[PDB]
């Protein structure tokens, strides 16, 4: 994803 | 916090 968020389940 | 992670509950 093109997103600045860093979390990944 | 000095962290690159972006999540906040």
């Amino acid at each position, epitope marked *: *994803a*093109r*997103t600045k968020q860093t*979390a*990944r389940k | 916090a000095r962290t*690159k992670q972006t999540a906040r509950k």
Partner: antibody
Framework: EVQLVETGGGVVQPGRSLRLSCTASGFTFRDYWMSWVRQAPGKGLEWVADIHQDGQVRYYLDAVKGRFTISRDNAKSSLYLQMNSLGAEDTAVYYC??????????????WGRGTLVTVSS | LTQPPSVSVAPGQTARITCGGT??????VHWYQQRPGQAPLVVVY???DRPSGIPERFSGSNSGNTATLTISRVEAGDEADYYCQVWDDSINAYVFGTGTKVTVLR
């Protein structure tokens, strides 16, 4: 002109120590997180360590935590990796790499040509 | 992160290199090209952007559990190892895929 250059590689005895230097040119070194990434002969890339612009916040691969120390000298535009208690698993090409996030994700946007450390008696 | 050890493709045709990892689609993926004895070089970053210098034949996508590097109109110069990479915020580590050798059929 913009470049990273690793030195300090070569043979080193198991259990002994070696210190790698990375000399940065062509850019403002103190503005960047800097990293070490390694690659054992014929193997894949393996991240080793990050160091924050101001030299105190540091992250390590588990397998080297306790034995390796990453440090920097911004006045000298230089990155260091102090390697102790070396073993055969540490034998690899060690790359100096610049950290950058442009749009979205942190990656390595500048690499040195790397230097090979061989752990051997 | 999981990558096929190798992909081979005929010149002019299309190479697809996958990068597997749970929910990898939820974050940004970047791709390095490494020629033998050379330093890694970014060819695709932030899922699908190209650094200047990099031919438009290199594209990327990323969704679900699989990011994909696509090389169109393959030529001999594209022979190399390719590595995907993410950053893992749960352990503060950079993570690389195991790498894929592209071979060009002739």
């Amino acid at each position: 002109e913009v470049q990273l250059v690793e030195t300090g590689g070569g043979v080193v005895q198991p259990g002994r120590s070696l210190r790698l230097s990375c000399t940065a040119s062509g850019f403002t070194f103190r503005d960047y997180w800097m990293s070490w990434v390694r690659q054992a002969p014929g193997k894949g890339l393996e991240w080793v360590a990050d160091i924050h612009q101001d030299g105190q916040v540091r992250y390590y691969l588990d397998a080297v935590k306790g034995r390796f120390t990453i440090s920097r000298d911004n006045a000298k535009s230089s990155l260091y990796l102090q390697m102790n208690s070396l073993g055969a698993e540490d034998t690899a090409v060690y790359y100096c790499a610049r950290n950058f996030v442009r749009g979205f994700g942190w990656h390595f946007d500048l690499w040195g040509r790397g230097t090979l450390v061989t752990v051997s008696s | 992160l999981t990558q096929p050890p190798s992909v081979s493709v005929a010149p002019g045709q299309t190479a697809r290199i996958t990068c597997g990892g749970t929910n990898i689609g939820d974050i940004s993926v970047h791709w390095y090209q490494q020629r033998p004895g050379q330093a890694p070089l970014v060819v695709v970053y932030d899922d699908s952007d190209r650094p200047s210098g990099i031919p438009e034949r290199f594209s990327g996508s990323n969704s679900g559990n699989t990011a994909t590097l696509t090389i169109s109109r393959v030529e001999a110069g594209d022979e190399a190892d390719y590595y995907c990479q993410v950053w893992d915020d749960s352990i503060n580590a950079y993570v690389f895929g195991t790498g894929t050798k592209v071979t060009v059929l002739r």
